[PDB]
Amino acid sequence: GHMKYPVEGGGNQDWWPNRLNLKVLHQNPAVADPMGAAFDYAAEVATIDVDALTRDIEEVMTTSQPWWPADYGHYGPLFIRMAWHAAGTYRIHDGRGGAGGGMQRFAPLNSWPDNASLDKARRLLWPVKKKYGKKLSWADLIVFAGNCALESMGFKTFGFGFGRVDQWEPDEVYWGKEATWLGDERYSGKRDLENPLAAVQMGLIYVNPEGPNGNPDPMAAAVDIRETFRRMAMNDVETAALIVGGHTFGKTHGAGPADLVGPEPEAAPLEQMGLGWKSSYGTGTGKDAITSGIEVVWTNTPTKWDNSFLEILYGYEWELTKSPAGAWQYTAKDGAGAGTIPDPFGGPGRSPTMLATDLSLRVDPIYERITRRWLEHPEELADEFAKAWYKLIHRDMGPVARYLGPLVPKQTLLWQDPVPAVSHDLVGEAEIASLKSQIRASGLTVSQLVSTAWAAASSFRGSDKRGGANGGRIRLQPQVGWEVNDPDGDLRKVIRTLEEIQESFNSAAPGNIKVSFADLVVLGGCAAIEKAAKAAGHNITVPFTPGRTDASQEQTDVESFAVLEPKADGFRNYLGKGNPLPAEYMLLDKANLLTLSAPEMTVLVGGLRVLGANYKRLPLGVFTEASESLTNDFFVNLLDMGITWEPSPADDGTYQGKDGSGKVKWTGSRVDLVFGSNSELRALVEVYGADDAQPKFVQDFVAAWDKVMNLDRFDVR
Amino acid sequence: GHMKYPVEGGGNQDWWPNRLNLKVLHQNPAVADPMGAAFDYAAEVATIDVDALTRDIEEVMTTSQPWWPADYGHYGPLFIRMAWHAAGTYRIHDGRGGAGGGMQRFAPLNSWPDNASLDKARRLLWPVKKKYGKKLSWADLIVFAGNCALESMGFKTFGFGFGRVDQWEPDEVYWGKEATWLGDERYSGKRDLENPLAAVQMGLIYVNPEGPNGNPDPMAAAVDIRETFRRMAMNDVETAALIVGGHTFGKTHGAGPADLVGPEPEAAPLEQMGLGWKSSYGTGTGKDAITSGIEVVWTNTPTKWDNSFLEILYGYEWELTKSPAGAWQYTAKDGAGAGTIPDPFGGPGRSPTMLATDLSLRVDPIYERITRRWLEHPEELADEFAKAWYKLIHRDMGPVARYLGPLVPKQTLLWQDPVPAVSHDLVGEAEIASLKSQIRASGLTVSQLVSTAWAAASSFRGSDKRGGANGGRIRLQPQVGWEVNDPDGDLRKVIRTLEEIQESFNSAAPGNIKVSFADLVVLGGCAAIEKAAKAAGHNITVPFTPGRTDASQEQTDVESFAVLEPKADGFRNYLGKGNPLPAEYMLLDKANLLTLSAPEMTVLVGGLRVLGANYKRLPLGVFTEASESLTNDFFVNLLDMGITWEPSPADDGTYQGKDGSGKVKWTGSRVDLVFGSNSELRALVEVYGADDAQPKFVQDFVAAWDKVMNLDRFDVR
Numbered sequence A, B: 001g002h003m004k005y006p007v008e009g010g011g012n013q014d015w016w017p018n019r020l021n022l023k024v025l026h027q028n029p030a031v032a033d034p035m036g037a038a039f040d041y042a043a044e045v046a047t048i049d050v051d052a053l054t055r056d057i058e059e060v061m062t063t064s065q066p067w068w069p070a071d072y073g074h075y076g077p078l079f080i081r082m083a084w085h086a087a088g089t090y091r092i093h094d095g096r097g098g099a100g101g102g103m104q105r106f107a108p109l110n111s112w113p114d115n116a117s118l119d120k121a122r123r124l125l126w127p128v129k130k131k132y133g134k135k136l137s138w139a140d141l142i143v144f145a146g147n148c149a150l151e152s153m154g155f156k157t158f159g160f161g162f163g164r165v166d167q168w169e170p171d172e173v174y175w176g177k178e179a180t181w182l183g184d185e186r187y188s189g190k191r192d193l194e195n196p197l198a199a200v201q202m203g204l205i206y207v208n209p210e211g212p213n214g215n216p217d218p219m220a221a222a223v224d225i226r227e228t229f230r231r232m233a234m235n236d237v238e239t240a241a242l243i244v245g246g247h248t249f250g251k252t253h254g255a256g257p258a259d260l261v262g263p264e265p266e267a268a269p270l271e272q273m274g275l276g277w278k279s280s281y282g283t284g285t286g287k288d289a290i291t292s293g294i295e296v297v298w299t300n301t302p303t304k305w306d307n308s309f310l311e312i313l314y315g316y317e318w319e320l321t322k323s324p325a326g327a328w329q330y331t332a333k334d335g336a337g338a339g340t341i342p343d344p345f346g347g348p349g350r351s352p353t354m355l356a357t358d359l360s361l362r363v364d365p366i367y368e369r370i371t372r373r374w375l376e377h378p379e380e381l382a383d384e385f386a387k388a389w390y391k392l393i394h395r396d397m398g399p400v401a402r403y404l405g406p407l408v409p410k411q412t413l414l415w416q417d418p419v420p421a422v423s424h425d426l427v428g429e430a431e432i433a434s435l436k437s438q439i440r441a442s443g444l445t446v447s448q449l450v451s452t453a454w455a456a457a458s459s460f461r462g463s464d465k466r467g468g469a470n471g472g473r474i475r476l477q478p479q480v481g482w483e484v485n486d487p488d489g490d491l492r493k494v495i496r497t498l499e500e501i502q503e504s505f506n507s508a509a510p511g512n513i514k515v516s517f518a519d520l521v522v523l524g525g526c527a528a529i530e531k532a533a534k535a536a537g538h539n540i541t542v543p544f545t546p547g548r549t550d551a552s553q554e555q556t557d558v559e560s561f562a563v564l565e566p567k568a569d570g571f572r573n574y575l576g577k578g579n580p581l582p583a584e585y586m587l588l589d590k591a592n593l594l595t596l597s598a599p600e601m602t603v604l605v606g607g608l609r610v611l612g613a614n615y616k617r618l619p620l621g622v623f624t625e626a627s628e629s630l631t632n633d634f635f636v637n638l639l640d641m642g643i644t645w646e647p648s649p650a651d652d653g654t655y656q657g658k659d660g661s662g663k664v665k666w667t668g669s670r671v672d673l674v675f676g677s678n679s680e681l682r683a684l685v686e687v688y689g690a691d692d693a694q695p696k697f698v699q700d701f702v703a704a705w706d707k708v709m710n711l712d713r714f715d716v717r
């Protein structure tokens, strides 16, 4: 092998392949952003003329371009696929993927096999982005064009929201271990897909259209359709609704051999200006277009919304056959419906066709019942598709406070993890002072207050922006019962107390001022930190932002919140079972999800340890003699060359730090020690452990603690 | 099984290995900096009590720590080696390496074979870092400790200066293509070393202590020593002094088998807290320590400065032998000098020993004269060493204005590319204005004013902070001939015409307000843009900062200025022969050395292109119909889907852009088209190419233009 220049590959990771990669904590650096610092997209889009924008998109859709002629003279279907794939990479496990960042325009998504041709699809929309500039992001545009396509072809969508902010660097996400496109090394046991993956192969949006492993078995394809969609937050009814709804439009492309198609976008020549899959088959486009290799046209209404997909799916019997490219697909038996389906450009007319995956909707018992019902009651499909497509394109958007524009529906949706609207005057400076005092007099320890606040706030993840302290869901199922927040003998006592303080406060509250349990949880932690700081001799006030509301069990989808449970949280020195990598890597991943930087992650760990936020109050990493006190003892002791570390005799995970006598003075985990071992983390440790660092430590820690508490507060920004 | 989670392995470089890595323009990301944006190291170091620091460092040198006992009860020599290596990575070709950023404490330098044991060395200084904190960087401390060591042992140095700001992410540098430590794939023909390397093997700091590729030939070694040192700005006299000077102290370490030495820092276990090379021979420390594997104690006074090194080198005859770790080294023949050399821990006398490289000083003709002389004139050694040691430790400090503290000698040095101190008053806001109007009215073209100013300013490289427009060296020898600046042409005329403006203005305009040539070169450029701006409906005023002074050819070491010559500059669409990588990669490297971000670079290429700054007024990337007007026509045409790009028939690295009629409308190079092909750069282009970005392009272009013009102005910041 050979080492390359940094500009052509880089280094370090090359000498230490498994080396922890701290670049995960500084994704999308301000340095790479072309927009100013004062630039706020929300304020730009809120100004856009939606009506004018729709007409412009409608113009592109019906204005074919010679470098990629529009099937049936309408890029509409193409755009629906584009939007479906854009939001289609979403996974419920870590909440990554999705259309929220417009990652389809960057590697590796832009060059995924399943995304072939979408490069022309996006190029076609340049005229629009050009006209609206900064008032419209690609992320919003790539998916609004999909919504627009539907509406111009007869389907009334439920609504739409803008707010997706463009990024300038691709988000590095784990898509699997396969180093070969379409590879598959992600199954164990009885067809069990590895987490967090939500696709059956490397490079696909969901499943193989030719059936599992290319086996045209519709009944088997269904099991995979059911799971990958479930992992993309869609039940049986939504999955069926989505497939039918989409395949009611357009067609597939496979006019010729798939080996006449050149290299993907990221591997193509410069002269191709970012486009990929250049075909040498005939004209290489339009009538001779090759995308998937399949040559299917589901309905006789490619550019119109109607119940044809199902009338056709059930109207004929199917047989297995191949396309010009040699892929599996189905055609009506006995030459039925011959010459019934219109051609995209010329027009010899063709006969019905379906994908193995389309037949799963009729062969599978559950799907069959769903689509049968819609075969007889088409109105029901129209509805389900609306709800499902709305969800599909907005899943990773986060709190509804982020949906901007005149097309956002007013209705509340359970999958949006709803929170009640503020219904009273908010607590002010005086009230916030009083409560902090009432909470310090409640009897709750610093550890309990701090732990409860962290547990509640740290449930947020920047990927799909779900979770957080708003809603006060820490006292509802399933959070009240997570092992990490371990109720065993304390969380329940903290909740009851805060609830009493809320009760007593609201009844005595001044003129129409009331506080929520949700704010109390967070305020409790802020009150505890100020106390601890004083104990350490640092009179400081911890920022607090009121406004959180309390959600009810009924407004909280238990099953949906399952994915937010921490299987690991080094900030609390917690390591559950079944994580992909060792504890330290899991810490960086958590840090990533909380949107923390290396310094912030560092300051938080040290603070949390000495404050007693450790799971089960374990002594790991609690390198301090003090209690209830916010000091920098963690970093000072971590750099103490007087203590000798060795892995503990029994299990690993735990280490022992012996001193001179040979006695054990400290005990720590892989998370604790990595800060003293890693050359880049240590640098950050030598900063907060210096003699002049105590006051800076307290400042940064309080700032970071404040950032976590407000991770989910899009209502005030 | 190959692809890894981002938190571990990585991402996109994996599917596309030779992928243009833009992260080279995201170096040392602000978000990864724990100090805060308002942190001013200079303000802090001015606060430090240098005397106290020295005493605190002397107390470290004489206090032996149990985990790594001190040879002769003094860590001074160890600190000298630590410091020399800190600065000894500096390569002349790109100006990278050096002790400027304290990179020795990060990967990969912290684990290099040649940096073995320095891990304990740095650890020993933590107590000093602990006490001075933010007022003292590891960068200054590491190299300053080496300076203190020298002094404590009897050598008076020329002086020392602080100002090296610590960084929080390793600088990614190309150190060779070898994927094996100590490997060698860097030589061709008759000992020709591939640029920009300054070492003979991978992981070494100059040459191999046992001779070329392990061949103990002193005459051969000298060839490598002379060569590697030259690429580190040291000549024969300096090289000889440096070697003699350093080996006047300490010893080497090779008491047992190397195989008994554990993994390096970056690859060692967490419990080692950042230290590697844990040896299992004896105590793996002090008495039984192994570092290079060679066992040599050069003089009989390891912790004192005298002329013993040279008296021994010439006092005996040398025979080849082997250290306990089986390494080549020399001993005195006839068993002379028995027990005449002290043991680091009380053992009995040893015997005079030397490295093949030490014998190079006596066997090589040129070195021999140099050293033989110092044998009878130690005062000359002392003098040259001090000069060389000073240079070595500050080589990458940039303009002397950056030297901080009370130990900086005022003596002017030629290797610092001296610039006259401002002697007159500086042009005011009225004079500036008048001066611009004079230049605009002069008669030079925007393509001459803009191009020359760039030719001048772009000479700067952020690696060692050399180059820049200060000094008006654009009209002095080295630079005036550079093919890039294309001497054979208008360079002369503009120089001659600008000088005629300096005189006219200075000859008649008392008040003590006088202006230099250096400033006029830049100002003329700031005027050409204002004009070119207006000539596009934009009454704007480009920022200008006076203060540049005019150096003299005498104050300009021509050969030292050789390395700063561009072998390519995508900003002027210039490509010379001999570049390691294709034009696009060289474009990134250049932007890196100019300290530019992705957006800054983008806005800068599209800008210069339209102003006619291209090398030899070439039409490449000149996507505009307008003459010399500042518009984003470049970005707007590059995104013109109505143009088809195809490599020029003449395989001359150019491309053609034909319109609908099949006629050639534009021509461009790889550098021009990369911005429309690379998904991340095309994104930036799509920002500056929109209908609403015209005012932003100009605003951004100017900002980035102002930045390049000021790169070297440390005298005013």
Ligand code: HEM
Pocket (backbone or CB within 6 Å): A071, A077, A078, A080, A081, A084, A117, A206, A207, A208, A209, A225, A242, A243, A245, A246, A247, A249, A250, A251, A252, A253, A254, A290, A291, A292, A293, A294, A355, A357
């Ligand atoms: C079970 C999962 C699915 C599979 C295996 C699948 C497969 C495919 C394939 C192979 C094509 C042809 C691509 C080409 O060669 O151009 C296609 C096209 C398309 N699909 Fe799907 N699909 C699935 C789900 C969906 C969903 C849920 C939607 C709803 C938004 C959808 C909407 C579309 C549209 C609109 C096209 C037309 C593209 C065009 O006309 O150019 N698909 N699909």
Ligand code: HEM
Pocket (backbone or CB within 6 Å): B071, B077, B078, B079, B080, B081, B084, B117, B206, B207, B208, B209, B225, B242, B243, B245, B246, B247, B249, B250, B251, B252, B253, B254, B290, B291, B292, B293, B294, B355, B357
């Ligand atoms: C021709 C270039 C040079 C070569 C090949 C070379 C090689 C070596 C080797 C092999 C060691 C032994 C390391 C160990 O095992 O502990 C050493 C030590 C040392 N060198 Fe050099 N060296 C060179 C130049 C220099 C220069 C220019 C200086 C002074 C600025 C210097 C200062 C030192 C010091 C102070 C030590 C001893 C550190 C201690 O006592 O632990 N060397 N060198």
